[PDB]
Structure 1
Amino acid sequence: NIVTVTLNMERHHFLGISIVGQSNDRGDGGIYIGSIMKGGAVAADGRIEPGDMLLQVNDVNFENMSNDDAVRVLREIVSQTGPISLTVAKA
């Protein structure tokens, strides 16, 4: 159950998501959507929901990434202009 969302990042500069480090029964330490804030690009799209696993955002893979690593990469990518593609596994 994989879903890829492509956000133009034109009406919003921020995704508007909080992430949390969690480990799953597949052995890795994954990144999951903690909560979705109002007024963000992710909330406007509506496909991603709390509890979904963040596998890839743009060209950066998040499958084996610590909670500390993921927060930096997301903030670094959000600071860049242009589109953001998120690949998630639905909860």
Structure 2
Amino acid sequence: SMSLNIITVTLNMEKYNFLGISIVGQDGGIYIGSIMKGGAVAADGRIEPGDMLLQVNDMNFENMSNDDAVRVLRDIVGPIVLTVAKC
């Protein structure tokens, strides 16, 4: 079968300074507020504004404070595997 609303997106940051997304926290509680020009995410094209960020390289964002999720994502930015939920 095919995963419909949970999708895996691989990004290679060797070519990009930044992800080019604004991440907001409101669990599914972290999501994409905007996608910016010139970043790894826009280049890939699969992630959309409003998608929820579930996982980055087997780190799950649930039970994570806001500072903690930034520090984690910061350190990670090898290939980056993002798991996002469309709904």
TM-score of the aligned structures, taking structure 1 as reference length: 0.80
Instruction: Determine the C-alpha separation between the residues in 2 that align with 1:32 and 1:65.
Output: 13
Is the CA contact 1:55–1:63 (under 8 Å) kept in the aligned structure 2?
Answer: yes
Question: Which residue number corresponds to residue 25 of structure 1?
Answer: none
**Cα separation, 1, equivalents of 2:30 and 2:69:** 7
Percent identity, please.
90
When structure 1 is superposed on structure 2, of 48-57 and 13-22 the one drifting more is: 13-22
**CA drift at 1:65:** 2.3
Q: What TM-score, normalized to structure 2?
A: 0.83
Structure 1 spans left out of the alignment, 5+ residues:
23-27
Is the contact made by 1:19 and 1:67 (CA closer than 8 Å) also made in structure 2?
A: no
Uncovered stretches (5+) of structure 2, i.e. residues with no partner: none
Off by >3 Å, runs of 4+ in structure 1: none
Contact 1:30–1:66 (CA under 8 A) maintained in structure 2: no
Q: Which SS does the other structure have where 1:70 is aligned?
A: helix
Quote the offset at 1:29 in angstroms.
5.8
CA contact (8 A) 1:29 1:66 kept: no
Number of residue pairs matched? 83
Aligned mates of 1:72, 1:53 — CA distance in 2: 18
- What is the DSSP-based 3-state SS (H/G/I as helix, E as strand, rest coil) of the residue aligned with 1:42? helix
Indicate conservation of the 8 Å contact 2:21/2:32, yes or no: yes
CA RMSD between the two structures: 1.5
Task: Give the SS at the match of 1:43.
Answer: helix
1:6 aligns to what SS in structure 2?
A: strand
SS of the equivalent of 2:48 reads coil
SS at match of 1:15: coil
Residue 68 of structure 1, CA deviation? 2.5
